[PDB]
Structure formats: C-alpha cells, structure tokens
Amino acid sequence: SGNAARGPPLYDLPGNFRYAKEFFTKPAISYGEFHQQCTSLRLFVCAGTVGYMLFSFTMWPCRSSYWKNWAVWKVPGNIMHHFSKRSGSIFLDEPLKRTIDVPKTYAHLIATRRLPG
Amino acid sequence: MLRYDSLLWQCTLAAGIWFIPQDVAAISAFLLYGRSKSRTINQPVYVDNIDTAANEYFKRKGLDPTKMIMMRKSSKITEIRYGEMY
Amino acid sequence: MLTVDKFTRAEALQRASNLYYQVLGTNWEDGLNLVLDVPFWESELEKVDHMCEPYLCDDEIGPIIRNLHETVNCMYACEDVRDHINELLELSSRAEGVMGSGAAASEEVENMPEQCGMVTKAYEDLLARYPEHHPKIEQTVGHGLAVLRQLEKFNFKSSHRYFF
Amino acid sequence: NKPVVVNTSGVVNTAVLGISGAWLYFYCVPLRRKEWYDIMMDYVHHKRTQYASNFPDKAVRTALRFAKV
Amino acid sequence: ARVPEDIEFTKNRYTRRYNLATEDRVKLLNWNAFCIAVTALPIAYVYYSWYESSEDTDMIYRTMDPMREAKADYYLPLLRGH
Amino acid sequence: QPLPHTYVLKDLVPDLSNFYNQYKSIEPFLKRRRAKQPGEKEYYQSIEDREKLDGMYECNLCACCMTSCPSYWWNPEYYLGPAVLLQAYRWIADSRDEFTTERMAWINDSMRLYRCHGIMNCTSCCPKGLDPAKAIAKMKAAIAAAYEPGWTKIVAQESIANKKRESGMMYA
Amino acid sequence: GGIGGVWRGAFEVASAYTALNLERQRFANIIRLGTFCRVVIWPVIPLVGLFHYIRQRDRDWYALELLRSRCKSEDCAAFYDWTMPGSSGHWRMQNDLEIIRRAANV
Amino acid sequence: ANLLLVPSDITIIEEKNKIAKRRIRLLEKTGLALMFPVFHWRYSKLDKHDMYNILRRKFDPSASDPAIDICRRRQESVRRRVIAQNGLLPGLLLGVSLPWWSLRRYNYQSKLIVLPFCAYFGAICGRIAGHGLSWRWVETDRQRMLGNLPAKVYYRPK
Numbered sequence: 001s002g003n004a005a006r007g008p009p010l011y012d013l014p015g016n017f018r019y020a021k022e023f024f025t026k027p028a029i030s031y032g033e034f035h036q037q038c039t040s041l042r043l044f045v046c047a048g049t050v051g052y053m054l055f056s057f058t059m060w061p062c063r064s065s066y067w068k069n070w071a072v073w074k075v076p077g078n079i080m081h082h083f084s085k086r087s088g089s090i091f092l093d094e095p096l097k098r099t100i101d102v103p104k105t106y107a108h109l110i111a112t113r114r115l116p117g
Numbered sequence: 118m119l120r121y122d123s124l125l126w127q128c129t130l131a132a133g134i135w136f137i138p139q140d141v142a143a144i145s146a147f148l149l150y151g152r153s154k155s156r157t158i159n160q161p162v163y164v165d166n167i168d169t170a171a172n173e174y175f176k177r178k179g180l181d182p183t184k185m186i187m188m189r190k191s192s193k194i195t196e197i198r199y200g201e202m203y
Numbered sequence: 204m205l206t207v208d209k210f211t212r213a214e215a216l217q218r219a220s221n222l223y224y225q226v227l228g229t230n231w232e233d234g235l236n237l238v239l240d241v242p243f244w245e246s247e248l249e250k251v252d253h254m255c256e257p258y259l260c261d262d263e264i265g266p267i268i269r270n271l272h273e274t275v276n277c278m279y280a281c282e283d284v285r286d287h288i289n290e291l292l293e294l295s296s297r298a299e300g301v302m303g304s305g306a307a308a309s310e311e312v313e314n315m316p317e318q319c320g321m322v323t324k325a326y327e328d329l330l331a332r333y334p335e336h337h338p339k340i341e342q343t344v345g346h347g348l349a350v351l352r353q354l355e356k357f358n359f360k361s362s363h364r365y366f367f
Numbered sequence: 368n369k370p371v372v373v374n375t376s377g378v379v380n381t382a383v384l385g386i387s388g389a390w391l392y393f394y395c396v397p398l399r400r401k402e403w404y405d406i407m408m409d410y411v412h413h414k415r416t417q418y419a420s421n422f423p424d425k426a427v428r429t430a431l432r433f434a435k436v
Numbered sequence: 437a438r439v440p441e442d443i444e445f446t447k448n449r450y451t452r453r454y455n456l457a458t459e460d461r462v463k464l465l466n467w468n469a470f471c472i473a474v475t476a477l478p479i480a481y482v483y484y485s486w487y488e489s490s491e492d493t494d495m496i497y498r499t500m501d502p503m504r505e506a507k508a509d510y511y512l513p514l515l516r517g518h
Numbered sequence: 519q520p521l522p523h524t525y526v527l528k529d530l531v532p533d534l535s536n537f538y539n540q541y542k543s544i545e546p547f548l549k550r551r552r553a554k555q556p557g558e559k560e561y562y563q564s565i566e567d568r569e570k571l572d573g574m575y576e577c578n579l580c581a582c583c584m585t586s587c588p589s590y591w592w593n594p595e596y597y598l599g600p601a602v603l604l605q606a607y608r609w610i611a612d613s614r615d616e617f618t619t620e621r622m623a624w625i626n627d628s629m630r631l632y633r634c635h636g637i638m639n640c641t642s643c644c645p646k647g648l649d650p651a652k653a654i655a656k657m658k659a660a661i662a663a664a665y666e667p668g669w670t671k672i673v674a675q676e677s678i679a680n681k682k683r684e685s686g687m688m689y690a
Numbered sequence: 691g692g693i694g695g696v697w698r699g700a701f702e703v704a705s706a707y708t709a710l711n712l713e714r715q716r717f718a719n720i721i722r723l724g725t726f727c728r729v730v731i732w733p734v735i736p737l738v739g740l741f742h743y744i745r746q747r748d749r750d751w752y753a754l755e756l757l758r759s760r761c762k763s764e765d766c767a768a769f770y771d772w773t774m775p776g777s778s779g780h781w782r783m784q785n786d787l788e789i790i791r792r793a794a795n796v
Numbered sequence: 797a798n799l800l801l802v803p804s805d806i807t808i809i810e811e812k813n814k815i816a817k818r819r820i821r822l823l824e825k826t827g828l829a830l831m832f833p834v835f836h837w838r839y840s841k842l843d844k845h846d847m848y849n850i851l852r853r854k855f856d857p858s859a860s861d862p863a864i865d866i867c868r869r870r871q872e873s874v875r876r877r878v879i880a881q882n883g884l885l886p887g888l889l890l891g892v893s894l895p896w897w898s899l900r901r902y903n904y905q906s907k908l909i910v911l912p913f914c915a916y917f918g919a920i921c922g923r924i925a926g927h928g929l930s931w932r933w934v935e936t937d938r939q940r941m942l943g944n945l946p947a948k949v950y951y952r953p954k
C-alpha cells in the first residue's frame with residue numbers, strides 16, 4: 001500500500017520545514033516532489049490555523065456559559081440527554097405556566113430599553 | 118474452478134461475518150436516534166373509539182363535522198382530512 | 204518565453220542539470236510516472252530553454268541542454284510504442300473474458316502476428332535513433348515486447364536476451 | 368451560581384484541539400488515506416484501449432451522426 | 437477484432453502522435469480543474485452559513501450590547517440544564 | 519494444475535520468462551567501488567553480518583510465492599514480486615556490497631515495491647520455509663528512513679553507467 | 691452549404707476548446723492549483739468552519755444570557771426549557787407554539 | 797387500539813387563514829416531483845404531499861395577525877426546501893456521465909469501482925449546491941422549526 005517514498009515523516013519537523021520552504025523558493029520538477037511540498041506545507045498551514053483559533057479564544061474569549069456543556073467529561077451525559085427526552089407532541093396541549101412573560105418583557109425592552117415598570 | 122476454500126468464497130464469508138454485525142448495530146443506532154426524535158414530536162397515542170375521539174376533536178378545534186372526510190387508512194389507523202382542501 | 208525573471212549562468216546550469224537527471228532517473232515504464240511528471244517537466248523545460256539560450260555554445264551548459272533534449276525525445280518516442288503494446292495486451296486480456304471464463308469476451312486481435320511485427324520494427328528504430336538511451340529503451344519497450352512474446356510466438360533480435 | 372466571570376478558554380480550546388486533531392489525523396496520518404490510490408493502481412491503471420467499442424463513444428457518435436454534426 | 441497496421445509512431449518531442457498517454461494527461465488536467473471548482477462548495481458554506489436561533493439575537497445586540505462589551509450577570513442554571 | 523495465472527506452454531509446464539527477466543533487472547551480483555587490489559584475500563564479513571543473509575540466500579526460485587501473490591496476478595509486468603524483492607533485500611543487506619543507496623533508490627518505486635499489500639501468501643506457500651513478506655517489510659522501512667532528495671539523480675547516474683550494456687533487462 | 695453548413699460551422703466554433711490548446715505554463719499551473727486545493731485547502735476549510743460555528747453559536751447563546759440578566763428573572767425555563775423537543779425550548783419558539791395553540795383551540 | 801391521525805394545529809390555522817390559491821412556480825413543481833417518497837411507518841415528518849398543500853395556499857402579505865405571520869414563515873421555509881430538491885438530479889447525472897466518459901476506454905472493473913462512488917459524490921455535491929442556493933444555510937432555527945412542524949398528528953384525547 002502507498003506510494004514510493006517522497007520525503008520525511010510527519011514528526012520530522014526540520015525535514016518538513018525544508019520542503020515547505022522550497023514550495024516558495026525552488027519550483028518542483030516532478031509531481032511527487034510537488035506533492036511532498038504541499039504535504040509538508042500542510043503541516044505548518046494547518047498548525048497555524050489551529051494556533052490562531054487557540055489564540056483567538058484566549059485573547060477574545062467566548063462570553064457564554066454554554067461552552068461548559070462542551071467539557072469532555074460532560075459529553076456522555078449530553079448524549080444521554082438527547083436520547084431521554086420526554087415523549088409527547090411538539091405542540092402544546094395546555095398553556096405553559098411561567099412566572100415571567102419573556103415575549104412581552106422582550107417587546108418592551110427592545111422599545112424603551114427599560115423593564116415594564 | 119470453483120472451490121469452497123477458494124479465496125473468493127472465504128473472503129466473502131469472512132467479510133459478511135465481520136461487517137454485517139458492525140453494520141446492523143450502526144444502522145440500528147441511527148434508527149434509534151430517529152425514534153427518539155419521533156416519539157418526542159408526535160408520540161402515537163391510542164384512543165378507544167374513533168367516532169367519539171373525532172367528535173371531541175371537531176368540538177375542540179371548532180371544525181364543522183360535515184366538511185371533514187374521515188377515512189380508514191388501515192385496520193388500526195383512521196384519518197380525518199379536510200374535504201375542501203385545494 | 205514571456206518572463207521577466209533573470210538567472211545567472213550558474214543557476215541556469217543547475218536547473219538544466221537537475222531536469223536532465225530527473226527525467227533520466229524517473230522510471231519510464233510506469234505510465235503514471237510519465238503522465239503525472241510530464242506536465243511539470245514541460246513547464247520546467249520551457250524555463251530552462253529560455254535561460255540557457257545564451258549558453259547554447261557554452262562548454263558546460265551546452266552539452267547538458269543537448270542531452271536533455273535527446274532524453275525528452277527518447278522519453279516521448281518510447282512512451283508511444285509501449286502505449287501501443289499496452290493497448291495490444293489489454294485487447295488480449297479483454298478477449299479472455301470475465302474471470303478468464305470467456306463469458307463476456309471481447310473479440311480477439313486478428314492481425315496480432317502483424318501487430319507484433321510493427322512493434323518490433325519500432326523497437327529497433329528507437330535503438331538506432333537513440334543509441335545512448337538503450338537502458339531506457341529496454342526498460343520500457345524491450346520489456347513490453349517480452350510480455351507480448353508470452354502471448355504470441357514471434358521473433359525479434361533480442362528475444363534470446365529476454366529468455367525466449 | 369452567579370460568578371462574576373466564567374472561564375471558557377480552557378474548555379473551548381480543548382474541544383478545538385480534539386476536533387481539529389481527529390480531523391487532521393484522519394486526513395493526513397493513516398496510510399488508509401491512500402486506499403483509493405492503491406485500488407486504482409491495482410485494477411484500473413494501464414488497462415485501457417482505443418481499439419475497443421464503448422457506449423459513451425458510440426452514444427456521442429450516433430447523436431452527432433443523427434444531427435449531421 | 438482488428439487494429440491499424442500503419443501507425444506513425446512518435447519520433448521526437450516535436451513530432452508526436454496522439455496516443456492514450458496524452459489523453460491521460462488531459463484527464464489529469466480536467467480532474468484537477470474539477471477539484472479547483474468543487475473547492476467553491478465548502479468555501480461557500482463557511483462564508484454564507486449563519487448559526488442563529490431567531491431574528492431576536494441581532495435586535496438584542498443592537499439594543500443591549502451594541503459595543504460587544506456589556507457584561508451580563510451569569511446565572512449558571514440557565515444553560516447548565518440544572 | 520499449472521502455477522496460478524501463468525501462461526501454460528503445455529500441460530503443467532508454466533511460462534516463467536517474465537520472472538527470469540525481473541530477476542535480471544535487480545542485478546544480483548556484488549558491486550564494489552574499488553576493484554580487488556592485487557594481493558588481497560576475501561572481503562571481510564563477520565559471522566553476525568553473515569547471519570543477516572540467512573533466510574534470504576536459500577531461495578530456490580521455485581516461483582511459488584510469485585504465483586501466489588494477488589498483486590502479481592493483477593500487475594505481473596510492473597510489480598517485481600515477492601521472490602525478486604527478497605533477493606533485492608539480500609543484496610541490500612550484504613555488508614560486502616557497496617551500492618546500498620543505488621539499489622534502494624531503484625527499488626523505491628510505487629509499482630515495483632509498494633504493490634505488496636501484505637497478503638502473506640508468499641510466506642505461507644514457500645517450499646523452503648523462507649519469509650519473503652518479512653523481508654519486504656524490512657526493505658520498506660529501511661527505504662522510508664533513508665530517503666534523500668538526491669536519490670533520483672543517483673538512479674540517473676547509474677543508468678548512464680549502463681549505457682553500453684547489451685539488450686536485456688537492466689538497472690535504468 | 692445551406693442551413694446544414696451553418697449548423698456544422700457553428701458547432702465547429704463551439705466545440706473548439708481543448709486542453710491540448712492550452713499553453714505549457716497554464717497546463718501545469720492548473721494541476722498545481724488543483725493539487726494544492728486537495729492537500730492544503732480542503733483540510734483547512736473544515737477547521738475555519740468550526741471557528742465560525744463556535745463564534746456564531748456563542749453570539750446566539752450570550753444574547754439569551756443578556757436577555758435574562760436585563761429581565762432579572764430566575765425562571766430559566768421561561769428563557770430556554772431543555773426538556774422540550776428540538777428547538778422549541780427557546781423562548782421565541784415557545785411563544786410561537788402558544789400562538790398556534792390559542793388560535794387552533796376554542 | 798385504534799389510532800386517529802388528524803390535521804395538526806398549524807394545518808388548522810393555515811386552512812382558516814388561506815385567502816385564495818397560490819400559483820406553484822416551475823421550480824417548485826419540479827422539486828416536488830423529484831422528491832423521494834416517504835414511507836410513514838409512524839407519522840412524524842412532512843412529505844411531498846403535505847408540502848404541496850402548504851405551497852398551494854395563499855395568505856395576505858400585509859396581514860399583521862401573529863398567527864398568519866407564522867403560516868407565511870412556514871410556507872417560506874417549505875418553499876426553500878422544495879426548490880432545493882432540484883439540485884439532486886443534475887448532480888447525480890453529471891456525477892455518473894462525466895466519470896463514465898473519462899473512463900470510457902478503461903475496463904469494466906474500473907467503471908464498477910469508480911462510478912458508484914462518483915455518483916453519490918455528485919448527488920451530494922448537487923444537494924449541497926441546491927440547499928445552498930435555496931437559502932437554507934441562512935435560515936434561523938425558528939424558521940427551520942416552523943417549516944418542519946408536522947401536518948398530521950396523532951390525536952391526544954382530553
């Protein structure tokens with residue numbers, strides 16, 4: 001399986017950097033070596049993307065607390081949550097009894113930037 | 118030409134024994150996720166007498182019982198429909 | 204060629220020598236090697252020609268360019284004959300039928316004795332035209348004719364050196 | 368229950384690394400990723416002829432002949 | 437079947453016969469061209485796709501968090517599910 | 519029956535001409551950069567070095583492993599096959615040979631070597647109890663670790679050295 | 691030629707393009723660009739897409755939190771009920787269902 | 797026991813508010829036709845017949861009644877779904893024809909190996925393109941929910 005060896009393994013950082021650099025400096029004179037230049041460049045281009053993402057979420061963090069639900073240990077519980085919802089109809093048989101009327105409170109807030117009172 | 122110990126027949130039984138179990142589970146999990154959604158959106162609810170149920174429905178929804186074509190789709194399934202639906 | 208890039212004679216020599224050994228080192232028998240590589244070789248060969256035009260009479264660059272041109276000529280010529288041999292052998296394989304049974308078998312080449320006389324002549328013409336590329340000619344066309352020999356019993360000069 | 372701030376960088380970054388790592392691994396590391404290249408090389412490569420009839424050529428040819436080109 | 441018996445084989449790089457190797461190189465170009473075009477599908481999804489619950493979301497930001505700096509008191513139970 | 523997927527010359531007599539040609543291609547003869555100096559005895563090889571060539575030099579070229587590989591059935595004229603590949607490793611592993619890099623560079627081809635998918639039919643049917651599958655795995659690992667950008671040029675230079683050779687399979 | 695000669699002539703000028711007519715540099719560049727897409731671009735797009743998903747769902751969720759803080763209400767289920775099927779938990783979706791119930795029922 | 801499938805509450809409202817019939821456009825017709833049938837082992841999803849009914853009704857575009865607004869929103873979400881189905885067939889056709897022409901000179905084995913996969917890929921690409929050009933990727937979660945509400949529901953007594 002596979003093809004003829006074209007370059008270093010992935011974990012060989014200095015070797016891959018050489019091929020990635022040649023992508024811009026020395027033009028390839030064969031498909032195999034051009035493909036190697038892309039793969040070695042893929043290592044660094046993909047690392048940079050992940051790097052910026054990590055940087056961006058530290059320097060400009062997400063503000064919601066929903067992401068606490070994306071913790072690894074909470075993943076199994078979330079899976080069970082979607083398989084264990086109460087059976088019934090999506091339509092409401094009876095009016096919902098809530099202590100607050102978010103729809104009306106939201107209409108007034110969007111209109112006066114003030115609570116109903 | 119044809120033999121039971123042939124690479125073809127022994128690679129076709131091996132593949133079946135190996136994949137059919139995995140696959141049955143995999144498809145079943147999808148079918149299970151489908152039921153979880155379905156039972157939470159429209160759970161099948163069993164009524165005793167269809168005629169009484171239909172009346173309570175027409176009364177509850179303000180629908181004229183004359184304009185509603187009630188048809189029996191299956192031995193255990195009836196269906197009320199609008200008769201004046203485009 | 205339309206380009207604004209400028210290269211020294213040392214850089215021109217390096218590019219030409221790199222392309223020459225790259226072509227002469229690549230395995231010509233494998234078709235995918237030539238199909239994938241020739242597009243890159245043609246782009247490079249155009250650039251090499253443009254930058255080596257001043258040095259066609261140079262004592263170092265000149266010979267490299269001449270050998271490079273000869274290798275490309277031999278590469279195209281050999282690939283053509285082996286492509287036809289591959290066509291003949293694939294016609295023969297399809298004639299065997301599905302599973303070798305003959306069930307859905309294609310019709311079988313009728314002038315195969317004559318199609319093998321055409322290829323062998325071409326093989327000899329390549330040998331004369333490209334005397335300094337016999338190793339490549341035997342890798343591609345020579346071995347191709349040895350495969351055909353296993354299907355049809357025909358005579359060519361180097362048949363004995365291919366164990367026939 | 369009412370914290371002044373919530374730390375999300377650690378959890379989000381962990382998810383990013385896990386999701387990105389799995390996808391990048393699947394696309395780059397395994398030799399299985401070259402399984403489509405092997406199958407084609409084994410069964411499709413160097414198996415072609417121009418001297419044998421095939422439906423796509425016959426179809427294009429007849430439809431041209433029918434329309435007088 | 438039968439096969440042509442008067443083929444003029446390629447003699448050099450500038451006197452070339454059209455063969456199935458050259459056709460395969462055109463296939464390489466056309467398949468690679470498809471790949472360039474199909475990249476427009478995944479790139480278009482990422483650019484045009486929006487994940488928003490309703491039209492309210494934008495109105496909330498225009499009236500309550502215009503500078504993306506307003507701080508909301510956090511009640512954990514709301515999104516913790518418990 | 520005759521050997522699988524071989525051209526039958528008559529009854530049970532196969533046509534193994536391709537197998538003989540492929541073997542000639544690997545050039546199975548010792549190569550050294552310097553010709554034996556006058557007054558020189560045997561080239562030194564330790565017992566341990568000689569032990570490396572133990573399971574590889576006993577191949578009788580029966581061609582069973584060859585005609586048992588599903589990959590030689592499909593691409594006979596492009597894949598060297600288990601027996602030839604093991605013989606190539608025998609000469610790449612022989613401490614006395616001095617052309618290790620040249621041999622590895624030539625064998626490092628998608629069709630020649632990497633058509634082995636590890637079916638292991640070659641090792642199961644070997645009449646001499648050899649393990650061609652293990653040898654091919656070692657040769658693939660050695661090539662992967664030792665590959666350099668300049669290998670292609672090395673192959674080309676050796677091809678130039680064989681310019682005056684006669685008409686037959688050869689390194690090129 | 692007649693109408694047939696106009697039909698054939700127009701097809702000859704419409705079926706004129708081939709990749710054999712392309713220049714050498716462009717022929718290679720198309721292959722290079724396609725190979726670059728498969729190797730580099732295709733793996734990156736899924737990752738850029740995850741970034742935007744998180745950022746956009748973070749905007750959707752913090753807006754609910756902003757609404758609850760301004761309302762100063764601890765009736766979480768009013769804002770988002772996690773026991774309701776699909777997306778019906780969101781306050782707006784709950785209101786839509788209420789409108790449907792009120793209109794349909796007597 | 798006996799089950800009773802009745803029009804859902806959304807259907808009831810849509811029937812009450814319908815002002816007239818609504819011309820079905822050409823792409824809506826083709827999309828509905830090219831839509832796969834659905835076998836209702838249990839009833840939880842909308843099919844091509846329910847979708848036609850939604851698209852054949854007409855509502856007042858200015859009406860400020862909240863109920864009518866829900867109906868119009870649903871009808872728009874159903875329309876985007878229907879016209880999106882027009883991209884599958886183009887994709888599947890090109891996903892077989894283009895590969896077949898390219899491998900027309902290759903052996904039967906190669907067409908069996910390649911064509912099935914390119915067909916599914918082409919169909920998937922066509923579906924992505926159709927759903928994308930029908931503005932499904934910019935729908936909110938409220939729009940998609942209203943367009944997915946079932947039209948038939950099992951009756952729940954009391």
Ligand SMILES: CCCCCCCCCCCCCCCCCC(=O)OC[C@H](COP(=O)([O-])OCC(O)COP(=O)([O-])OC[C@@H](COC(=O)CCCCCCCCCCCCCCCCC)OC(=O)CCCCCCCCCCCCCCCCC)OC(=O)CCCCCCCCCCCCCCCCC
Nearest residue numbers: 394400401403406407408411412460464467729910913917
């Ligand atoms: C179900 C949906 C999918 C269905 C299939 C979709 C089919 C359409 C694909 C369109 C995209 C472009 C395809 C390639 C264009 C050609 C490029 C090219 O020439 O490059 C050199 C090409 C190899 O390219 P490479 O990038 O150097 O090496 C590929 C490696 O993957 C090493 O590359 P890497 O290091 O970048 O590794 C990344 C790897 C990452 O790998 C993966 O993503 C893993 C999956 C790999 C296998 C998945 C498929 C398994 C099914 C069987 C596959 C074989 C049957 C054929 C399939 C259709 C092939 C078109 O990605 C790839 O495999 C490459 C991207 C394109 C792959 C397209 C086919 C598979 C799509 C799979 C999607 C779903 C996978 C789900 C897997 C299940 C688990 C989730 O070599 C050849 O051309 C060999 C040809 C030999 C025969 C002679 C043919 C004539 C020669 C003239 C030119 C012919 C060109 C056209 C070839 C195809 C004809 C059918």
Ligand SMILES: CCCCCCCCCCCCCCCCCC(=O)OC[C@H](COP(=O)([O-])OCC[N+](C)(C)C)OC(=O)CCCCCCCCCCCCCCCCC
Nearest residue numbers: 020021022044045046047048049052053056060738741745
């Ligand atoms: C020869 C070796 C070559 C090596 C090349 C290495 C390439 C590295 C590739 C980096 C790609 C990063 C792209 C991230 C895209 C995803 C993020 C996203 O969508 O965010 C939206 C964001 C905006 O979203 P936001 O959420 O961050 O917005 C909040 C931020 N403020 C408040 C400021 C608005 O914008 C971007 O996409 C910007 C991304 C910038 C990425 C910069 C990458 C530079 C890489 C330099 C590499 C240098 C290599 C040198 C080699 C030397 C060799 C000799």
Ligand SMILES: CCCCCCCCCCCCCCCCCC(=O)OC[C@H](COP(=O)([O-])OCC[N+](C)(C)C)OC(=O)CCCCCCCCCCCCCCCCC
Nearest residue numbers: 069070075078079377380381382384385389515516517772
């Ligand atoms: C800064 C430190 C860095 C450390 C780096 C360490 C990285 C490695 C650790 C793993 C991180 C990845 C976590 C998964 C992503 C977050 C989970 C998520 O979003 O789920 C929450 C979501 C939460 O959605 P929710 O709507 O239920 O959340 C609300 C929850 N309640 C109702 C309680 C309020 O879960 C679900 O929606 C349920 C389905 C989850 C399915 C998870 C499948 C696993 C996905 C990862 C596969 C990895 C493959 C590689 C392994 C090979 C396996 C064979």
Ligand SMILES: COC1=C(OC)C(=O)C(CC=C(C)C)=C(C)C1=O
Nearest residue numbers: 296300301302303410591592905909
């Ligand atoms: C003898 O008939 C056949 C071949 O010729 C050697 C094949 O290549 C192959 C191998 C190809 C595949 C797709 C496994 C098969 C199956 C076949 O029947």
Ligand code: SF4
Nearest residue numbers: 577578579580583644
């Ligand atoms: S089967 Fe064993 S002994 Fe015979 S040629 Fe192969 S490796 Fe040598």
Ligand code: F3S
Nearest residue numbers: 587634635638639640
């Ligand atoms: S059977 Fe063949 S695939 Fe390799 S393991 Fe032996 S040479």
Ligand SMILES: [K+]
Nearest residue numbers: 610612615618
């Ligand atoms: K040695």
